[PDB]
Write a protein that binds this ligand. Structure first.
Ligand SMILES: [Zn+2]
Ligand SMILES: [Zn+2]
Ligand SMILES: [Zn+2]
Lengths: 45, 69, 98, 266, 115
């Protein structure tokens, strides 16, 4: 459901609630939440 | 970590002189003072911007990207 | 029950805010709930619908910034745990020490 | 004409060295301050980041983008965004640039300000283009990408003055000197053994007669004949810095006159 | 956190006027004019031009605090000379001198051909 990226192999995964947090390609148990798709506004000062 | 766009004191744009500063040192074999004077940095406020800059972005680029497309 | 007065709208379905989202003071960045004993009588606003209480992690009351990185993993015990990094500018102002 | 006199000693693309004569100290200093802080200029004001996989922070990149000098020749045709009736920004009060960079190369791809692309309708004006000065044709080094890193963002550039933020200042360093021989005695020269030997003569000492070292102190003499050197960041031409500074100071004084007449009529 | 907005250096706020002229009871024929959203750039110029007026007995300006972009200008003129008219004459002479300076700089720049 929610997009994550494995910390070492950098493969995009989709994890649901019941899924254990673990990479399906290289098995690294550290996953990063994907950057938000909404545009974020910064003042250039 | 990357070259500042402008000189802090006066506001001269020094961010476009960084890549030509390195060329004046490595392939023209100039010392740093003549390389600074050649680029037009005559005030020492501008000279300290390029002369004392540390290019830490080169060390940051050796790490693999976390989000790779 | 016992929800914090800060906003929860920045959280996703997993109770975690996505990286890149701007946060402000006393905003929830990690959402967590714990079950309670049903059918109690406390604070007046207690009903049978309130099966949980909020154990969420808000931001610091004065701090703000951007969520830089949200890291989900398991500890040694296998329990899921998260680390949320918030990034901000410290621009020098009156009273900063040099 | 009668009034302040200008003799330009040197002129360049980004430097004008002139002698401002027959003028008071206050008006020369006010012109210097107005050129530094009061000329309206176009600079990137808001950054909306879509993708940032660089090693630099979003707010880091936004601060670097604000300091990019943009062309501001026709900035008077642009409107202040606070004075515009749009909701956030439009073509009447802003210029919208975009920046899309990808690290498709194995080596590091440098992201320059020449990669900024105007996507708003300029309406035939002469604003929004990033200023290119070096011979290589690239602009200011904005960022660096390794392979697979992406930077997609949209900048909105609005007009402003350097009093609001120094990114709107086109004046760089303004050299300002008067009385190089200290004939007005406005400085008491610190020295160890000899003030004339230990203090180097300025380059402007050739443009004034040295004192005769026997003549009495001229108490009636005032400060005139200012030696000024305006340097341009590149946003406007270096002559337009001086002309727009005179115009801005004139507009400030005229606004004071207008307010005085408006409360005189009441 | 407590930092004021920078446009408060040059933008008149709600319910704030550009000038605010009060009579001064210390000396006869003297006024104090509060300039809002201005600084030493206007104050020094106006004061030094008012001191060139022959019928002006006193002309001074002060920025009471650097936090607030405002300055007070005290003008005392001779009898029968309105200090508002002295301010008008000083402003007009500044306008004329700046116009002459602009024309002179434009002509001298057009003489330059190495740009
Ligand atoms: Zn993996
Ligand atoms: Zn400098
Ligand atoms: Zn608009």
């Amino acid at each position: 459901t929610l997009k994550y990226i494995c910390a070492e192999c950098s493969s995009k995964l989709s994890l649901s609630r019941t899924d254990a947090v673990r990479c399906k390609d290289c098995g690294h148990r550290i996953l990063l939440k994907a950057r938000t798709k909404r545009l974020v506004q910064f003042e250039a000062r | 970590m990357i070259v500042p766009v402008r000189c802090f004191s006066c506001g001269k744009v020094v961010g476009d002189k960084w890549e030509s500063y390195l060329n004046l040192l490595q392939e023209d074999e100039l010392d740093e003072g003549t390389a600074l004077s050649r680029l037009g940095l005559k005030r020492y406020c501008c000279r300290r911007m390029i002369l004392t800059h540390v290019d830490l972005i080169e060390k940051f680029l050796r790490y693999n990207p976390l989000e790779k497309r | 029950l016992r929800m914090k007065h800060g906003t929860y709208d920045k959280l996703d379905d997993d109770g975690l805010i996505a990286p890149g989202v701007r946060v402000s003071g006393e905003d929830v960045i990690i959402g967590k709930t714990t079950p309670i004993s049903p059918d109690e009588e406390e604070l007046g606003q207690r009903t049978a619908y309130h099966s949980k209480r909020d154990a969420s992690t808000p931001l610091r009351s004065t701090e703000n910034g951007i969520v830089d990185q949200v890291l989900v993993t398991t500890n040694q015990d296998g329990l899921k745990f998260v680390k949320v990094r918030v990034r901000t500018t410290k621009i020098p102002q009156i009273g900063d020490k040099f | 004409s009668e009034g302040p006199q200008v003799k330009i000693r040197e002129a360049s693309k980004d430097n004008v060295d002139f002698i401002l004569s027959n003028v008071d100290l206050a008006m020369a200093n006010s012109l210097r301050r107005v050129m530094i802080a009061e000329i309206p200029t176009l600079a990137i004001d808001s950054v909306e980041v879509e993708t940032n996989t660089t090693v630099l922070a979003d707010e880091f990149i936004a601060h670097r983008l604000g300091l990019i000098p943009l062309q501001s020749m026709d900035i008077e045709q642009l409107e202040y965004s606070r004075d515009c009736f749009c909701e956030d920004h439009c073509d009447k009060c802003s210029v919208v640039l975009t920046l899309q960079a990808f690290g498709e190369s194995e080596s590091t791809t440098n992201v320059y300000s020449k990669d900024l692309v105007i996507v708003s309708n300029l309406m035939g004006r002469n604003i929004g283009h990033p200023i290119i000065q070096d011979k290589e044709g690239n602009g200011v080094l904005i960022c660096k990408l390794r392979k697979g890193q992406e930077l997609k963002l949209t900048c909105v550039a609005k007009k402003g003055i350097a009093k609001e933020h120094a990114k709107w200042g086109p004046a760089a360093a303004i050299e300002f000197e008067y009385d190089p021989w200290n004939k007005l005695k406005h400085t008491d020269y610190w020295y160890e053994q000899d003030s004339a030997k230990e203090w180097p003569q300025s380059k402007n000492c050739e443009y004034e007669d040295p004192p005769n070292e026997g003549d009495p102190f001229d108490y009636k003499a005032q400060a005139d004949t200012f030696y000024m050197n305006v340097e341009s960041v590149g946003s406007i031409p270096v002559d337009q810095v001086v002309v727009r500074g005179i115009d801005t100071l004139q507009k400030k004084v005229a606004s004071i006159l207008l307010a005085l007449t408006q409360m005189d009529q009441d | 956190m407590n930092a004021p907005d920078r446009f408060e250096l040059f933008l008149l706020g709600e319910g704030e006027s550009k000038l605010k002229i009060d009579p001064d009871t210390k000396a006869p024929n003297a006024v104090v004019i509060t300039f809002e959203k201005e600084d030493h750039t206007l104050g020094n110029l106006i004061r030094a031009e008012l001191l060139n007026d022959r019928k002006v007995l006193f002309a001074a300006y002060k920025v009471e605090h650097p936090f607030f972009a405002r300055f007070k200008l005290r003008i005392q003129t001779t009898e029968g000379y309105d200090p508002k008219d002295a301010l008008k004459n000083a402003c007009n002479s500044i306008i004329n001198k700046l116009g002459a300076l602009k024309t002179n700089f434009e002509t001298e720049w057009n003489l330059q051909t190495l740009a």
